[PDB]
């Protein structure tokens, strides 16, 4: 019984692109236990993503278009689902770092509130890793792929602009901040066996890729993290330069846009992507680097714990 | 199996209450949702609301917000129905109704107690 | 805000004719629905399921197109077991178990 599919999910939200085309919320889900079965899961290839990634991209260009009126921009909840024939099953082993078999599987029909926020560098606004901190890859072994650590506690930032000014700023606790990048650093020691680690600013380039890019309340902001990413953490409130700039390169596809011509969002972080390097002495440092890139990855940190397939 | 029994019929006077119960066998009483729905001959079927034997959670259709509500006994494994301010054109059957299947969803309603009818009358 | 729509109230046709029901659906229920069947006097029946799939427990004269918004009951040379009321069902949100407001069906004999 039962096997593994493509389908173009639906969305239900709990609405007061969500308008008319997500159902409300479901009230009342059913996570109905299974028993026996080891699944094998694979974050790194569901079409899930596919159907985030294609959704997302219609949302996004339709509710912030580039030259332009000015209206709000916030993301709500908005769990996906199967139609009938077809069921999400669900991983809920706490530890289960995206591939593999997990045991404690249980099948349900509508996914977890997502909030499909897109960034670089750092997770927004995203569910938090069980238990302890999680590390994804595609394979810890080859580097190209790039790592998404899943924090245990969330750290919240806060970004202002105020007057009516050039570029604006951002802030966040250093105290929690460094504990909980310790306590990766300490983590990704465990896999690499107890080696040092070092972070490093992003190799640069593609500007959005070398900043925590992001857009919050309709406008996209540039943050330096230079200062957060640093080796030797000094633990007082940290401060970011970030710029909002009105001209940005497209996650849409091929091409760049620009936007038209006092506000603040708060977020919570709740995971980070990061780039490896090369040691082929192996040093006795392994150094990892802001990363991002493709949005794909965006999606699977948030859904990794499912797989869609269907009923036989 | 699969089997419902609902209380029998009744008459209690208008501007009252009352209470139909729906015993459930055959399955275990708990993970499986009770669906309450009402037939008034001159409609049709309409649906009233849902109850989480595992829970109490309810929730409940627009038209029957406030005048129905919903009770489980989780022990000797049956359901409560109650309906109040009891107006004239209330007086119909009432169906209690499960969700069967075996795994992930996918809720039709399955098994249906016989019905009870409900006349308001003074 | 998802407004069930049943296509004809009554019906009335002769034995071993055809018979087909639709039901619109205001908005996208994705592919759930399910189609029932009450006698006058008895506990309704469900026929089909996940808007298409017949309940095995029904005879193949019954069928059911739709998926996603327009939805269709066919009954292929009704008999006179039919002569009922049919309902249409919504139930992946989960609660939002509606119903249409049915139709009957009668005999031209």
């Known amino acids: 019984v039962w096997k593994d599919a493509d389908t173009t999910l639906f969305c239900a939200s709990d609405a007061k692109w969500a308008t008319h085309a997500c159902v409300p919320t479901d009230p009342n889900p059913q996570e109905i236990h299974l028993e026996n079965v080891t699944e094998n899961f694979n974050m790194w290839k569901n079409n899930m993503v596919e159907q985030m990634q294609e959704d997302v991209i219609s949302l996004w260009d339709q509710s912030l278009q580039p030259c332009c009126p000015k209206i709000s921009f916030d993301p709500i909840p908005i769990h996906y689902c199967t139609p009938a024939g077809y069921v999400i099953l669900k991983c809920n082993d706490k530890n289960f770092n995206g591939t593999g078999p997990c045991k404690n599987v249980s099948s349900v029909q509508c996914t977890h509130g997502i909030k499909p926020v897109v960034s670089t560098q750092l997770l927004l606004n995203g569910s938090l890793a069980e238990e302890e901190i999680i590390i994804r890859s595609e394979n810890l072994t080859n580097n190209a792929k790039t790592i998404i650590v899943h924090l245990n506690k969330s750290v919240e930032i806060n970004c202002t602009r105020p007057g009516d000014i050039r570029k604006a700023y951002c802030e966040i606790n250093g105290t929690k901040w460094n504990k909980v990048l310790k306590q990766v650093t300490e983590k990704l020691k465990e896999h690499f066996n107890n080696k040092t680690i070092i972070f490093q600013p992003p190799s640069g380039g593609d500007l959005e890729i070398t900043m925590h890019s992001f857009n919050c309340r309709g406008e996209f902001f540039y943050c330096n993290t230079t200062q957060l990413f640093n080796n030797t953490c000094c633990n007082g409130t940290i401060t970011l330069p970030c710029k909002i700039k009105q001209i940005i390169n497209m996650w849409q596809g091929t091409g760049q846009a620009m936007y038209a011509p006092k506000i603040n969002c708060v977020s919570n972080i709740t995971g980070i992507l990061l780039t490896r390097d090369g040691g082929a002495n192996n040093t006795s440092n392994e150094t990892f680097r802001p990363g991002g890139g493709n949005i794909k990855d965006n999606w699977r940190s948030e859904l990794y714990k499912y797989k869609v397939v269907q009923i036989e | 199996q699969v089997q419902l029994v609902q209380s029998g019929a009744e008459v209690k006077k208008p501007g009252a209450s009352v209470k139909v119960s729906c015993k459930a066998s055959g399955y275990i009483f708990i993970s499986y949702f009770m669906h309450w729905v009402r037939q008034a001959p001159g409609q049709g079927l309409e649906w009233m609301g849902i109850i989480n034997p595992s829970s109490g959670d309810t929730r409940y259709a627009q038209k029957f917000q406030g005048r129905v509500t919903m009770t489980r006994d989780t022990s000797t494994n049956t359901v409560y129905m109650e309906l109040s301010s009891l107006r004239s054109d209330d007086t119909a059957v009432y169906y209690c109704?499960?969700?069967?299947?075996?795994?992930?969803?996918?809720?039709?309603?399955?098994?249906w107690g016989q019905g009870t009818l409900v006349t308001v009358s003074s | 805000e998802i407004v069930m729509t049943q296509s004809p109230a009554t019906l009335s046709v002769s034995p071993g004719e055809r018979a087909t029901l639709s039901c619109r659906a205001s908005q996208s229920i994705s592919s759930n629905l399910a189609w029932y069947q009450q006698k006058p006097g008895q506990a309704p029946r469900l026929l089909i399921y996940?808007?298409?799939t017949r309940a095995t427990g029904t005879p193949a004269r019954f069928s059911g197109s739709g998926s996603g918004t327009e939805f269709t009951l066919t009954i292929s040379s009704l008999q006179s077991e039919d002569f009922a009321s049919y309902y249409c069902?919504?139930?992946?949100?989960?609660?939002?178990?509606?119903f249409g407001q049915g139709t009957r069906l009668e005999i031209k004999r």
């Open positions: 996940g808007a298409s």
């Open positions: 069902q919504q139930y992946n949100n989960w609660p939002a178990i509606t």
């Open positions: 109704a499960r969700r069967p299947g075996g795994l992930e969803r996918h809720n039709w309603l399955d098994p």
